[PDB]
């Protein structure tokens, strides 16, 4: 278990999996706001959502404005929700489990 | 046979991890005390140890397969929680005789401390004992004399020694500094010794220091009639330096000298431990840096470990702590590396920190020196917990003695003497010490004088509850 | 020195000292440092590269050499011997010395770079 | 506690012997085998052997009362008569580790064989046997370097080494010596060898030698392409002619030294041995003088004894006898302590003369030397007895070669190359000996007529008895 690898990891999958939730939520803005735009986004992103830094420097070099609005959103996100993860996943997995134990064991 | 070779990062606990071995005599074996990471298992933990202070690392190499690696490896034989706390066990490793350079600590410690302690999967690791087996033991000189040749060239017998450091640590010229000696001397007390840090410095350099203490050595040992010594600290720079302080020492005439062994290092300290008993000078050595290492015991080697090296690179005195005093020491703890220190024959126990049973196949005990914030009040439980052999130091203890200098020395050798007067008349020093302290208090002004200074928090409250 | 077993204190860190320049003066410190050491290798332009010979224990001083010699030969500026790898029954320190000098001159004849061993 | 002083002569018996004690695995063990003068039983003789080897003399002293004589004394466990033999018994006889010097042979044999030799009591004694504990073992260097160690240097590997002793024995100037030297080392031999009792004389001064041989093994390792040697015997009156001696073959980088450890002595030999071992120089012991000491059955101590004490002294070769050559030398024996120089665990087993147990916790095996009136004919059975790792020797057997040195040479190189090949290619040396030799007899005229001149008496006798 190299914990501050592992950590290190799973900072950047939480980084990537926000920045494809602050693009669904510009996207549904942009649904009411700029409905070409939104269709726009919304066709460059798909499959490109892997790596969350790497979309958003390519997303740069096409709109500068409208990776702000990522950079914002996914940013935000963090700001109201990452307090509340380590106590939901500890406690979703020692429920998951105690369920499995249960059944099985 | 040579079981093909398979590259690539396998489990430590494959190969190490060996629960059915049975230790030989001449293993060498170790207890650690380790937590490991969340999802790390305990037996891979252990493994892992074991690995890497022996003969493995952390990807399968084809050159274990050009020797045998079953003969050479570390063996992780047992793991056991301990009890009453989470994620902490005690791995007990055996290490092949062969494993080892014959006669030195270093590159035991080398092997055992050596890279194990900054494992990732590891959160903290503390090393509490290590069983030297006889055949290594012997292989090592030991201490220069021992307890029972340094009495005899002493001619102290019959109770504990009495010792001081000068104070202040540093500051004083060398002339001042004898001064202090020759006053402490005279009244009493069998040693004095430099402070560790105490080596050469502007306000005092360390060849002054050696002719004006051998003068207050002179002075002092004709007047009283009894044999006087002073430790004189070798610790120094380089090996050359440290060689050239012990050789002028010796010039002088000089009975005991002193060495921090950690802060100077054991390669240091073996070298002067044999030129000590080539040369008939006795060795006191000096701890310090030790509680950096000894101190928590989550993490850190116990202070037993350390012991047990010094007795094998080498020293006449070392020491042990008080219990009582203004450092730490626990009491039980202590009982158990005491008789690791002198005894020739250890039982384990583990009421008293002794994980492994220890044979000294005759290499000679070392001296236990209690030092640091004691005074006389201490004097009763201290012969109580150390008995005779043992020095008993005093620096503020005897300097800080209202009324100055030469009644503070005063007031400590009269105690002393009381001491060893009541102990050889069978006086039970445990249970009768504050009584004989008080009795001689009675005809020494300047002991009643420290004795009320250094009593200390009394406590006394009350009744009432009257029917 | 003393003050990390005082009763009065639960632990005790030293994270830093500020060693004075005056001070720093009275020491001669690496007997070459890095430039000299890039100079006298004539090794420039990259991190150098070295290997602990490995297992940590139980090779002889011939089979020690010849893990030495493939390691340079291949590309590696340095080899290492373990940290307790020092003079013990199964390799004597001054049979590995003289075998990995072996080593060491015949990798670096066919190499053509300058080759160490620790 | 001290019993009480009682003056006078008291039975050996009522001391050490202890047949009821079990030997600690830290305890020296001796075997003597001993016939006791009419009227003197077993049990007292074996008492004084244990006594008199140890802490004890003829009468009461006072002073036994100031030690504690039960951890000190010798002490006879068990007598038991040789099977088959009136008067002759074996004693078994425990020695505290204590009681000897660490890593001085010369301590050991002080006490073991120092004066009960020669006890009246006593009519014949010889010591068969000693166990060395593990513990005292590692107290000693051993070989400079052993057997892995010496074929890793040499690039030998795959068949016994071959050497040659230079003859006639003593006569020959420096130049003729070398230049028999170059003569048989570039004939197939990887060895020659200085006779034993060639140190410096008139006739050759040991410098010139030194110089001659030098030249010479460098001309035939230049022809041959295989490394040679040759044993110079740095054999002196003093320790300081040793050295010297010593010093310049290391300054010549000559490869190997050869030592006569016996009639030197073993104080010297192991300063030759820790030096050796420090300046990379193989050492070959030569055993003059031990058939005065080990010959007879009755008296003396078996060459086994002395055999394991040159293993701790510190030799890399060591004569072992030939079996079937022109000196005596018992095959079960033999193979016996072939084991106990070589391998690192021999058990106990009397039908090979080996009493104890021995352990040499990886200290590194000698090379045995068969030396001595073997030939040609002699090769398959000494590869079968001796095996790969030992060094034959044949020095009348190659300068004795009816067409003179080089084709006497060119014999025995060639007979040497034809085993060490069938033995890599599989065949058995000792079935397929004579016939390996027949068959490069067929190519090899040299071979052939060395073959023929030392085949030997033969016998063949007959068929009568006819129907």
Request: aromatic letters at 10%.
């Given at each position: 278990?190299?914990?501050?690898?592992?950590?290190?990891?799973?900072?950047?999958?939480?980084?990537?999996?926000?920045?494809?939730?602050?693009?669904?939520?510009?996207?549904?803005?942009?649904?009411?706001?700029?409905?070409?735009?939104?269709?726009?986004?919304?066709?460059?992103?798909?499959?490109?959502?892997?790596?969350?830094?790497?979309?958003?420097?390519?997303?740069?070099?096409?709109?500068?404005?409208?990776?702000?609005?990522?950079?914002?959103?996914?940013?935000?996100?963090?700001?109201?929700?990452?307090?509340?993860?380590?106590?939901?996943?500890?406690?979703?997995?020692?429920?998951?489990?105690?369920?499995?134990?249960?059944?099985?064991? | 046979?040579?079981?093909?070779?398979?590259?690539?990062?396998?489990?430590?606990?494959?190969?190490?991890?060996?629960?059915?071995?049975?230790?030989?005599?001449?293993?060498?074996?170790?207890?650690?005390?380790?937590?490991?990471?969340?999802?790390?298992?305990?037996?891979?933990?252990?493994?892992?140890?074991?690995?890497?202070?022996?003969?493995?690392?952390?990807?399968?190499?084809?050159?274990?397969?050009?020797?045998?690696?079953?003969?050479?490896?570390?063996?992780?034989?047992?793991?056991?929680?301990?009890?009453?706390?989470?994620?902490?066990?005690?791995?007990?490793?055996?290490?092949?005789?062969?494993?080892?350079?014959?006669?030195?600590?270093?590159?035991?410690?080398?092997?055992?401390?050596?890279?194990?302690?900054?494992?990732?999967?590891?959160?903290?690791?503390?090393?509490?004992?290590?069983?030297?087996?006889?055949?290594?033991?012997?292989?090592?000189?030991?201490?220069?004399?021992?307890?029972?040749?340094?009495?005899?060239?002493?001619?102290?017998?019959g109770r504990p020694?009495?010792?001081?450091?000068?104070?202040?640590?540093?500051?004083?010229?060398?002339?001042?500094?004898?001064?202090?000696?020759?006053?402490?001397?005279?009244?009493?007390?069998?040693?004095?010794?430099?402070?560790?840090?105490?080596?050469?410095?502007?306000?005092?350099?360390?060849?002054?220091?050696?002719?004006?203490?051998?003068?207050?050595?002179?002075?002092?040992?004709?007047?009283?009639?009894?044999?006087?010594?002073?430790?004189?600290?070798?610790?120094?720079?380089?090996?050359?330096?440290?060689?050239?302080?012990?050789?002028?020492?010796?010039?002088?005439?000089?009975?005991?000298?002193?060495?921090?062994?950690?802060?100077?290092?054991?390669?240091?300290?073996?070298?002067?431990?044999?030129?000590?008993?080539?040369?008939?000078?006795?060795?006191?050595?000096?701890?310090?840096?030790?509680?950096?290492?000894?101190?928590?015991?989550?993490?850190?080697?116990?202070?037993?470990?350390?012991?047990?090296?010094?007795?094998?690179?080498?020293?006449?005195?070392?020491?042990?702590?008080?219990?009582?005093?203004?450092?730490?020491?626990?009491?039980?703890?202590?009982?158990?590396?005491?008789?690791?220190?002198?005894?020739?024959?250890?039982?384990?126990?583990?009421?008293?920190?002794?994980?492994?049973?220890?044979?000294?196949?005759?290499?000679?005990?070392?001296?236990?020196?209690?030092?640091?914030?004691?005074?006389?009040?201490?004097m009763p439980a201290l012969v109580e917990?150390?008995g005779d052999?043992?020095?008993?130091?005093?620096?503020?203890?005897?300097?800080?003695?209202?009324?100055?200098?030469?009644?503070?020395?005063?007031?400590?050798?009269v105690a002393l003497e009381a001491c060893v007067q009541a102990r050889n008349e069978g006086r039970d020093l445990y249970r009768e010490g504050g009584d004989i302290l008080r009795e001689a208090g009675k005809?020494?002004?300047?002991?009643?004088?420290?004795?009320?200074?250094?009593?200390?928090?009394?406590?006394?409250?009350?009744?009432?509850?009257?029917?």
């Open positions: 278990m190299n914990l501050k690898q592992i950590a290190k990891d799973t900072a950047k999958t939480l980084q990537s999996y926000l920045t494809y939730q602050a693009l669904r939520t510009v996207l549904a803005q942009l649904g009411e706001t700029n409905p070409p735009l939104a269709l726009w986004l919304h066709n460059f992103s798909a499959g490109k959502v892997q790596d969350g830094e790497k979309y958003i420097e390519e997303l740069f070099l096409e709109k500068p404005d409208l990776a702000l609005r990522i950079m914002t959103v996914r940013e935000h996100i963090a700001e109201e929700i990452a307090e509340f993860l380590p106590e939901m996943v500890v406690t979703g997995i020692q429920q998951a489990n105690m369920e499995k134990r249960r059944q099985h064991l | 046979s040579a079981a093909g070779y398979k590259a690539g990062v396998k489990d430590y606990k494959l190969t190490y991890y060996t629960p059915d071995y049975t230790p030989k005599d001449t293993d060498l074996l170790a207890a650690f005390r380790f937590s490991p990471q969340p999802g790390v298992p305990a037996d891979e933990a252990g493994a892992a140890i074991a690995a890497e202070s022996s003969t493995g690392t952390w990807t399968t190499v084809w050159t274990d397969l050009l020797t045998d690696m079953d003969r050479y490896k570390g063996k992780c034989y047992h793991i056991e929680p301990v009890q009453g706390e989470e994620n902490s066990y005690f791995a007990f490793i055996a290490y092949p005789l062969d494993l080892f350079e014959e006669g030195s600590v270093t590159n035991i410690l080398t092997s055992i401390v050596g890279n194990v302690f900054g494992f990732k999967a590891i959160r903290s690791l503390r090393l509490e004992d290590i069983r030297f087996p006889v055949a290594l033991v012997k292989t090592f000189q030991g201490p220069p004399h021992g307890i029972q040749v340094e009495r005899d060239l002493l001619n102290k017998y020694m009495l010792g001081c450091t000068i104070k202040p640590k540093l500051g004083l010229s060398a002339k001042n500094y004898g001064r202090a000696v020759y006053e402490c001397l005279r009244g009493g007390l069998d040693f004095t010794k430099d402070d560790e840090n105490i080596n050469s410095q502007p306000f005092q350099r360390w060849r002054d220091r050696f002719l004006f203490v051998a003068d207050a050595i002179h002075k002092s040992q004709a007047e009283t009639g009894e044999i006087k010594g002073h430790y004189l600290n070798v610790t120094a720079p380089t090996c050359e330096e440290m060689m050239k302080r012990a050789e002028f020492a010796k010039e002088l005439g000089m009975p005991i000298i002193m060495h921090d062994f950690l802060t100077a290092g054991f390669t240091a300290n073996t070298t002067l431990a044999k030129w000590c008993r080539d040369n008939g000078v006795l060795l006191h050595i000096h701890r310090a840096m030790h509680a950096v290492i000894d101190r928590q015991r989550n993490h850190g080697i116990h202070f037993r470990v350390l012991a047990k090296c010094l007795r094998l690179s080498g020293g006449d005195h070392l020491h042990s702590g008080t219990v009582v005093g203004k450092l730490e020491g626990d009491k039980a703890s202590t009982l158990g590396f005491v008789d690791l220190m002198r005894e020739d024959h250890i039982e384990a126990d583990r009421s008293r920190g002794v994980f492994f049973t220890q044979d000294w196949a005759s290499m000679p005990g070392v001296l236990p020196v209690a030092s640091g914030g004691i005074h006389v009040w201490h917990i150390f052999d043992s020095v008993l130091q005093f620096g503020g203890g005897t300097l800080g003695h209202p009324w100055g200098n030469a009644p503070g020395a005063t007031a400590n050798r005809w020494s002004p300047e002991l009643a004088a420290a004795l009320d200074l250094w009593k200390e928090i009394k406590f006394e409250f009350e009744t009432m509850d009257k029917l």
